[PDB]
Design a protein around this ligand. Structure first.
Ligand SMILES: CCC(CC)(c1ccc(C#CC(O)(C(F)(F)F)C(F)(F)F)c(C)c1)c1ccc(OC[C@@H](O)CCC(=O)O)c(C)c1
Length: 250
């Protein structure tokens, strides 16, 4: 059966598309405002050298910090998100931050050369840039696999925005107080997505594949958190970060 999207479900999609258009700049025009990228000679991928220099850390921390601000803006526009307590909204934003960043980064990701192409050569990011910021192969390898897997689903913008919204409004995050209300908001979004796929996505199992991506995001989040913790042990690391990044990941 293919039930049609309700007036409410069509309204939810319009709100989320509008929210994304207002919080995502596909021209990457603010990137010149970040601390500049610096790429040291590191053909060997030396952990000692990367930790001593952390050459890409100020630029990558400014990029993630900027993206978190956009994610906070997007979340405020999710139907029902404002119905949650400020404590729950913050727990949800903090626990989902890195996952939503990985999802939204997919728009700039290109399978042409396996990079995140955000304008000129200075804003073209590869595996080596993330290692130059103190991260390791245990994070970057599955991150690239995830980006390809997601790119290959060829999501409609409607599906991409619904997926980010479902990711954020997750009742299974440590520290949430009103899990039942969060689940009700997520179910309203999940039902919109399942209905949309059946009614608007042409052939040639997409909903199941999108849910699997949300599970992959949990493992990437756990690895990112372990690696951030290591990176934070580097003397003088905090100046290379931002207050928002320090709060979200600290
Ligand atoms: C996910 C892939 C990548 C690859 C370079 C990325 C970057 C930085 C980090 C980090 C880190 C930190 O641990 C911390 F703490 F910051 F998390 C560190 F800094 F400490 F190292 C990681 C793990 C991955 C990336 C590429 C394009 C991006 O935005 C493109 C547009 O999406 C922007 C516009 C928008 O989003 O509106 C974004 C956001 C991120």
């Amino acid at each position: 059966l293919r039930p049609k999207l309700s007036e409410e479900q069509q309204r939810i999609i319009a709100i989320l598309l509008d929210a994304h258009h207002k919080t995502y700049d596909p021209t990457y025009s603010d990137f010149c405002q970040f601390r500049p990228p610096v790429r040291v000679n590191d053909g060997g991928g030396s952990v000692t050298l990367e930790l001593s220099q952390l050459s890409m850390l100020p630029h990558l921390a400014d990029l993630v910090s900027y993206s978190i601000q956009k994610v906070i803006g997007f979340a405020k526009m999710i139907p029902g998100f404002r119905d949650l307590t400020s404590e729950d909204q913050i727990v949800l934003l903090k626990s989902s931050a890195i996952e939503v960043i990985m999802l939204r980064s997919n728009e700039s990701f290109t399978m042409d050369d396996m990079s995140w192409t955000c304008g000129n050569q200075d804003y073209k990011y590869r595996v080596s840039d993330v290692t130059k910021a103190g991260h390791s192969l245990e994070l970057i390898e599955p991150l690239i696999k995830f980006q390809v897997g997601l790119k290959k689903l060829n999501l409609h913008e409607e599906e991409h925005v619904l997926l980010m919204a479902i990711c954020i409004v997750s009742p299974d995050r440590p520290g949430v107080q009103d899990a039942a209300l969060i689940e009700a908001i997520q179910d309203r979004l999940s039902n919109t997505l399942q209905t949309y796929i059946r009614c608007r996505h042409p052939p040639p199992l997409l909903y199941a594949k999108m849910i699997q991506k949300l599970a992959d995001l949990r493992s990437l989040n756990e690895e990112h958190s372990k690696q951030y913790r290591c990176l934070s042990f580097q003397p003088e690391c905090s100046m290379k970060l931002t207050p928002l990044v320090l709060e979200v990941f600290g």
